[PDB]
Structures are given as structure tokens and as C-alpha cells.
Structure 1
Amino acid sequence: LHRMKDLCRYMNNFDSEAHAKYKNQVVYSTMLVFFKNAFQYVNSIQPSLFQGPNAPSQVPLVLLEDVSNVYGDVEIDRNKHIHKKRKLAEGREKTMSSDDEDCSAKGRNRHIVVNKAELANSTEVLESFKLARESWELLYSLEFLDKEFTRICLAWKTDTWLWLRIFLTDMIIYQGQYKKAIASLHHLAALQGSISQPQITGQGTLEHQRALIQLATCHFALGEYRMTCEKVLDLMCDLKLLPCTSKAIMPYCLHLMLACFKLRAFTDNRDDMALGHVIVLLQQEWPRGENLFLKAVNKICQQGNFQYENFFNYVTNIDMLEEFAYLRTQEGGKIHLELLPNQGMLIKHHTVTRGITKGVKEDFRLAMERQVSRCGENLMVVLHRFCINEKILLLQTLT
């Protein structure tokens, strides 16, 4: 993992004859590191393609954006959350779509905060997973190793090849280029379904869903919140915590959107839509979502107004409804509450007020009863409905 720091410390473009031994050793070390990283990526992210016809053909996993790092205090950036998220994800290194190659220096710019039980190893496994990008970049620095990697990618049909596709997906995931991950997700459906080998077949493939989730994370890192939400909805129907099953992929899609909304709200931006999304996402994880809820409350107070199609009238998220009700008063900054379209009455002003004697009160009671009846229902359907009916707010928040 750290051995690439010594091999890459020599002259990259050294003499072919004068430093023949050094160049050969560097090339061999780079090739071995690239092979080890490819094998590790294939094992961790491609469990179905790495299994033969008689093998178990388990559900493959995927690597997601370091949203926990942004939420965590290790990478708590006071003014590097909105525009620097892509920079924090990729390091501005993997500009090009490198198939079967990782050109990124994020391993040294930051680290992975993994405990003894969160990951397999707090020293070996985490360093090996994080240093894959650094080792691959060091290999690409050497001309011979880079040429060998390019030749392997070209000859091996990297889209079709399991190890090279896994490496490309991991590189795109860290780079934030959602297009490459989306293309991989599209190819992972037909490739797995039309092959006689044992894997996940059809549209409901675990590898395809995991790749779609990775594409959503990359889109969220790139700042395209609408594209990330669309990818997350499609999937639903350095290190991160995520299971290898396809069922767990759906409940992890909203994490990237929640991180982006929290980063936007905590920044100078006063986008009320991001605050509403973060409030809706407050029930996803706790007490990690408490910071997101606080940022949402601060953004709502700063903006002073909100615009949405259906937040408390039809959406039945318990946490979102409670947050909206709490923020309707002066606790949320004494701002107007808009649950229905051009409705909500006055709750920011003094409590002693008449307004509508029994019309607005009856409408609010009916909306609350409808939300309570649908409270048992999952928030995924409500989120998808708001993502389609109220896409204007999401688009405004995204830019």
C-alpha cells in the first residue's frame, strides 16, 4: 500500500540503459500494484462477474462517495462544501475517463476515517483500498507501466472485461463522472443477462443497481442534483459503509443527496429546497442527520421563504412533517410555511390570530390526517413523487 511511495520516488522518465535495473524494478512494481488493485476492486465490487457458472454468483457491491467524510468532523470544511465537493471527491486529477486506470491523487490529499469494526482492518485493508488510486497514478507516471495499462485496456475489451470494468467504475465513482458509471450500469445489465455464466440476470441485476447508485453518487459529487436524483430513482425501482445486496442499494441512494443538501445549506447559499430535502433526509441516519437538520433550519431562517408543491399536504415523512411544523413558528427563523400550493396560513407571526375561522383549519386537519394515515408507507414513493411533481425546487437547489 505504501510501497508505491518509494518506487515512484525515483526518476519517472529515467534512462533506459543507465537505469535499466531501476526502470525494470519500477515497472514490475507498478504492474504488480495495478494487478493487486484490479483484483481487489473486482473482488469487492464485482462478485457476480468474478464467479463461474457453478459458483455462488453473489450480489456485487459498489463504492460510493465519501459523504460520511464531509458530514464527519475530520473533513469539516467551513467554506469548501458547495463547489469543493467535486474537488474533495476527485482531487481535480481524473479529468479524463481512464478505463482500467486510476489517475487520482486523493489518497494523499485526504484519508479514510474507518474504525476497528467499521472496516476489516484499520491499518491494512483501509490503506490498501485508499492507495489504489495513488499506486495507479504512480504507475501511469512511468511510461512503460502506463503503456502496458493502456494496451491491456484496449486489448482486453475493458467494458466487457470484469476487472477492467470494476476499475473503471471505481475510477468514475471517485472522479465524479456520472456518464461513465451510467454507461457501465447500462452495459452491466445486458452483459450479465445475455451471458450463460451464473450472475444477476435481467433488469433487476445487483451489479447494475450498484453501478446506478455509484452513478448517482458521482452525479451528486459533480453538482448535478437533478441527474443524481433521477439516477437514484431509477436505481430504486475513500471508504464508505454499504452492503453488497441490491436491497440495501435503494436506501443508500438518498445519502449523497442529503450530503449535497447539507453542504449547500451550511454554505452561504440559502436554498430553501435544499433545506427541505435535508429535513426529509433527517430520518435516514441519526445522530448524523442532526447536523443536516440544523443546517436546514439555518438555511430556512436565512431565506425567510419556501416554495414547494407537496411537503406536508401529501408527503407523509414523519421527520420532515415534524421539522416543518417546528420551523413554522419562530424557532425556524419566523418564516412563512408553505405546505400546499400558495397555502399555509400565518404561523410565523403571533399565535393569537383568526385568519380563516374553520376553512384553513379544516384543510390543515385533513392534510395532517392524510399524512398520518400514510405515515406507515415508505418515504421512497413520496420522495419520487416530489422529485417529479416538484422538480422546479430541485432544479433551483441544484443551480
Structure 2
Amino acid sequence: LHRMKDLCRYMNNFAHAKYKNQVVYSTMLVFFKNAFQYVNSIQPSLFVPLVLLEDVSNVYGRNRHIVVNKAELANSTEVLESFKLARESWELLYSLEFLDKEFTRICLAWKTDTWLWLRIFLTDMIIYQGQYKKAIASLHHLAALQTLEHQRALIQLATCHFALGEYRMTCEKVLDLMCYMVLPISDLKLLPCTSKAIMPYCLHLMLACFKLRAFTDNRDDMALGHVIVLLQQEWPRGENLFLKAVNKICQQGNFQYENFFNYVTNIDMLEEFAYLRTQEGGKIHLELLPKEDFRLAMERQVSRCGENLMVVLHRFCINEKILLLQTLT
């Protein structure tokens, strides 16, 4: 590819059929070879499927990189190299004008559906590119052509709908995503189509969305509730954000997040809320219920310590689908 780049550099910067034919066809075979390798690595069912995502790890805080662990993908280095080389092949195909035209021709001559392997590989290059609308269209193409590949389509739609500032369509796609994910448990990521890597990513997605929806100097209370509920995930990393939420509630003093004692299964949450209610965290009026009934409800909930966190978080996600109304901001 780079020998051709030097030779094609010379043939492009300035019939000359040989150079253009080489730059198209040699790239054509190498592009299908590398794309076949990539989609034989990720989503291997076309010849656990893997998906090229964008995980926002810092929810408490041509030159793109894929953050894939060596555990879920032990051959991640050369798979990433093959994806990069095929992306460069596609870029060099569409870069030179004659190469662009006759590559479009040769790809149109074969199955323009791009099957599923080539279609997935196009979705992956486009998501890695930084452009998400053609990625979303290619994922719709997948869904038309197509937890197996439904997990693939939904999770890729989620990461292409995040796209730096949508924050709602991602939530809807992800909510429809766990509907297929039933299990009792900061850059682009490549995670499998299983719960272990998709559930934390989806929860971080909702956490970031509701964090940006909540801390906007407004009086939105439901967003604060969603924020606290999702923050239970991965303690004690959410310590500072919970402290900020407590300070905000002390400033306001009108927390009305009914169904509160149905999702908040954390001892520290309840101890802090009781701290706020006695004299010293202020005298903060808390409508956590849909005087005695309040302490009585906290006494029921301290008895529910444990209650493995993903089960209750998934129950919150599926039962309270009305979170899209607060997600509108």
C-alpha cells in the first residue's frame, strides 16, 4: 500500500492506464481481504460478535484510536492494523478522482448490498471516521439486511447517535437494546455483543446524558434523580458527583423523585440522605415517596442493601421508559 502510495503519489500528483488500474484493483483485493479479516474477527458469524463503539469512560470528569482490551480480543493488534490498512485503502480509492470513480464502478459491479460483512465493515470505517450520519444509514442498511447482529445494529446505532450532542436517540436505541440483553451481569472502544461490556457502556451513556441534562443551573429534579440512580454504578468513582448532587439538593431542598426507593439500593445514598434530614445537612425537605412514612421507607430500603446493582438498574431502565421526557433537554 505504501509502495503504491509513493508510486501512486508520482502517478497522481501529476492514457496512463497501468497506474490507475493498479491503484484501483490492487487496492480492491487488499481492501476486501482486510475487510474480510476485520469482519471475520469482529462479528465472525458471517463466514461473540464484536462492535466498534465509543465508550465515554470519563463520565466523572485520521487521528482516531480504538481502545480495545487484549482480553476480549487477544488478536486485537493485527485486527486493528488490518482495519486501519483497509480504511486507508478505501480512502485512497475515494481520494484519487479516477480511482474514486472506477472504484465506485467496480464496487457497484459486485453486490452493492455489501452483503453483511462488507456492510458491517463500511459501518465500522464510517463510525471510526468521525462521521456518523452515513454510519447510521449503513446501520439501517444492516438492519434491513440483517446478542448476534441485532445487538450489533443497536449498539452501533447508539454510538453513531451519540455523535457529540444528541443524547436522546442514543437513549432510545439503548433502551431498545437491553430489551434483547437479559442477563444478571475515553475514546472509541471495541467491545463484544454481551452484557459484560455493553451494559457498563450503556449505563455510562445514560449517566453522561443525564449528567449533562441535570447540571445546567436549572431546577430539573427528575434529571437529578436519574443522575443519582445511574451513579450507583461503579462506586466509589461517583463520589464527587454525588457530593455535588447533595450540595445542589441542599441549595434547593425540593427533591421529588418518587419511585426513589425502588431504584436506589445503596447504603451510602441513604446514610447521606438521612444526614441531610436531621439538622446538619440543612433541613432539606425530601419527597422520596410516591414524616413517619419517610423514615419507615428508608428502613425498608436499608434492608434491601445488596440487591445486585445491574438487576435494579435494568429494572429502572425498562419500567421507567418515561425517562425520555426528561431526556428531551
Q: TM-score, normalised by structure 2?
A: 0.67
CA distance in 1, matches of 2:324, 2:98: 47
Are 1:373 and 2:327 matched, yes or no? no
| Cα deviation 1:330-349 (Å, max 9, x = unaligned) | 999987544235xxxxxxxx
Q: Distance in 1 between matches of 2:285 and 2:39?
A: 51
- Aligned-residue sequence identity (percent) comes to 100
**For the residues of structure 2 that align with 1:228 and 1:22, how far apart are their CA atoms?**
45
Which digits, 9 at most, give the CA deviation of each residue in 1:298-329, with x for residues without a partner?
A: 77678775553422355546676567667779
What residue in structure 1 maps to residue 184 of structure 2? none
* 1:165 to partner: Cα distance: 2.0
Instruction: Assess if the C-alpha contact under 8 Å between 1:306 and 1:337 holds in 2.
Output: yes
1:273-307: per-residue Cα shift (whole Å, max 9, x none)? Answer: 55543433334335655565566567767877555
Provide closer, same or farther for how the CA distance between residues 209 and 116 of structure 1 changes in structure 2, counting only shifts above 3 A.
Answer: closer
Distance 1:160 1:5, change over 3 A: closer
The match for 2:92 is 138
Residue 239 and residue 313 in structure 1: after superposition, are their counterparts in 2 closer, same or farther (change >3 A)? closer
Q: Which of 312, 318, 327 is 2:261 aligned to?
A: 312
Q: Is the 8 A contact 1:217 1:253 kept in 2?
A: no
* Cα 1:127–1:170 shift into 2, 3 Å: same
Q: 1:261 to 1:313 in 2, by over 3 A?
A: closer
Q: Quote the offset at 1:226 in angstroms.
A: 3.5
CA separation of 1:65 and 1:288: change in aligned 2, threshold 3 A: farther
User: CA shift at 1:207, angstroms?
Assistant: 1.7
Offset, 1:232: 1.9
Asked whether the equivalents of residues 155 and 174 of structure 2 are also in contact (C-alpha less than 8 Å), the reply is yes
Distance 2:10 2:273 in 1: 59
More strand by share: 2
Secondary structure of 1:331's counterpart equals coil
Structure 1 residue 141, shift from structure 2 partner: 1.5
Q: CA offsets per residue over residues 165-196 of structure 1, 9 Å max, x none? A: 212332464478888777877876786xxxxx
- Larger RCO: 1 or 2 (CA < 8 Å, sep 6+): 2
Aligned residues of 2:68 and 2:190 also touching (Cα < 8 A): no
- SS of aligned partner of 1:247: helix
Per the TM alignment, residue 27 of structure 1 is displaced from its structure 2 partner at its CA by 3.2
Q: 1:60 aligns with which of 28, 43, 49?
A: 49
Please say if residues 169 and 211 of structure 1, whose CA atoms lie closer than 8 Å, have aligned partners that are also in contact.
no
Q: CA deviation at 1:38?
A: 1.8
Structure 1 residues 330 and 363 mapped into 2: Cα distance closer, same or farther (>3 Å)?
Answer: closer
1:143 to 1:329, Cα distance in 2 relative to 1, 3 A? farther
- Cα distance, 1:44 vs structure 2: 3.1
Contact 1:312 1:367 in 2 (8 A): yes
Q: In the superposition, relative to structure 1, how do residues 330 and 33 fare at CA in structure 2: closer, same or farther (>3 Å)?
A: farther
Kindly state the Cα deviation for residue 259 of structure 1 after the two structures are TM-superposed: 3.4
Going from structure 1 to structure 2, the CA distance change for 1:333 and 1:240 (only over 3 Å counts) comes to: farther
Matched residue, 1:223: 165
Shift of residue 111, structure 1, vs aligned partner: 3.4
Relative distance call for 1:231 and 1:122 in structure 2 (3 A) is closer
Quote the Cα distance in structure 1 between the aligned partners of 2:36 and 2:95.
21
Gaps of 5+ in 1: 51-58, 72-106, 192-204, 342-360
Contact 2:59/2:204 (<8 A) preserved: no
Could you tell me how far apart the structure 1 residues matched to 2:276 and 2:102 are? 59
Question: What is the distance in 2 between the residues matched to 1:214 and 1:307?
Answer: 35
- Describe how 1:5-16 pairs up with structure 2 within 5 A: 14=14
Q: Tell me, yes or no, if the aligned pair for 2:39 and 2:120 is still in contact at 8 Å.
A: yes
Quote the RMSD (CA, aligned, Å): 5.1
Change in 2 beyond 3 A, CA 1:60/1:111: closer
Cα-to-partner distance string for 1:211-232 (whole Å, 9 max, x where unaligned): 2122223333354434323322
Give the secondary-structure state (helix, strand or coil) at the position aligned to 2:292.
helix
How far residue 161 of structure 1 moved from its aligned partner, in angstroms, is: 0.4
> d(CA) in 1 for partners of 2:131 and 2:218?
24
Task: Provide the secondary structure at the position in 2 that maps to 1:64.
Answer: strand
Task: Flag the 1:327–1:186 CA change in 2: closer, same or farther, 3 A.
Answer: farther
- What 5-or-longer segments of structure 2 have no aligned partner? 180-186
Is 1:225–1:395's contact at 8 Å kept on the other side of the alignment? no
Q: Could you tell me how far apart the structure 2 residues matched to 1:112 and 1:2 are?
A: 22
